[PDB]
């Protein structure tokens, strides 16, 4: 199976853009993509991460299982909404069903690796467990990385999921000091497979494929496959 | 009667949780009832910008008892503030040092880390975690109510349980008035993984030493400060 959760260490990493970037530089490669979003929050405010993939990126098969008006974790939007999340099997199914040859298939988190996504306490670890992903996280280039990357990786390595590597999901211009040192010291507890520009999200498809490409290793991308 | 210290570790879930301002406010609810309070920090970071951590916790509740050993001027992760200044990280036998030596009986020690749990404050990768575990401490953790909150707290949780170090419990280092819906829903989830020891009125960090006082007293709970120390 070809499998990849995209996991954010925080709130506003960029999570999404990432998801985009690596459909993109994906299918210029001439590899097929799926993205799957089990369960989208904030729909009260706009909104919905499938939709940003399939502009930004030309995705067609664009997975999702259920929306929450509140812009909170899963579990709370759910509480809040008086209605259940997904099933475990519901989650899991979609993702396995999604899984073809010659295909990448990427399945975007709500929330952050040890939240509930689907009941009873089922986690996006415990989907990526199930389905055999290995795990891409998405950080920030900012103070405070090296302590949320190092505890996300404790928590991929304790349930044995594999990590595909780093995105920045947002590299500053000019960088700085602080994101400058954080590059270098991310660099050295994994593999870095992208830096995204600062302000890529707003960019028209074309220009978002341009970046894409450049952004990540071609080699690497084409071998997830 | 407790013949040695109870020792707390101070970590965050990310930055700018409030860690200080809930040193502070726990040290304070603990003079007020007659215990003796000793901050630690050993690594500070950021003093060329004016951070001083162990300053601000002496102004905020008036806290005598305060133990540097590594200051580093840029206000960066440790490891690279001190080579940014030529500096060496502190060894994990300094930090343990620094804090062995506040040992009085029926004292209480607050450990204040710099950033997060796993951030390398000694070489090689040695953590506030590992001195959590060296000297015998458990762990409070200071929280955000705001979106991120869960994750960053699990996150946080489940690293200390992988070295058993005990959770202390939880702060919310800065709590809104009047908390909106995401808010309120946090702390009722927060208080769902652990016990939530207080949640610190926004604003906190600018009232007087009087006002202060009177916020940390009425802060925690009396039976937990109290039982803290025997």
Known sequence: ????????????????????????????????????????????????????????????????????????????????????????????????????????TLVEGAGGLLVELAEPGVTLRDVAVDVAAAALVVVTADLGTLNHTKLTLEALAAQQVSCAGLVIGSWPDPPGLVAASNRSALARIAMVRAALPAGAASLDAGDFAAMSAAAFDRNWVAGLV
């Open 1 to 104: 199976m070809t499998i990849l959760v995209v996991t954010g260490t925080g709130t506003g990493v960029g999570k999404t853009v990432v998801c985009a970037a690596l459909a993109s530089a994906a299918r210029q490669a001439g590899i097929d993509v799926a993205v799957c979003k089990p369960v989208q929050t904030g729909t009260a405010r706009g909104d919905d991460d499938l939709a940003e993939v399939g502009r930004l990126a030309g995705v067609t098969q664009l997975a999702g299982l259920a929306r929450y008006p509140q812009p909170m974790a899963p579990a709370a939007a759910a509480e809040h909404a008086g209605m259940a999340l997904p099933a475990r099997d519901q989650i899991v199914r979609l993702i396995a069903d999604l899984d073809r040859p010659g295909r990448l």
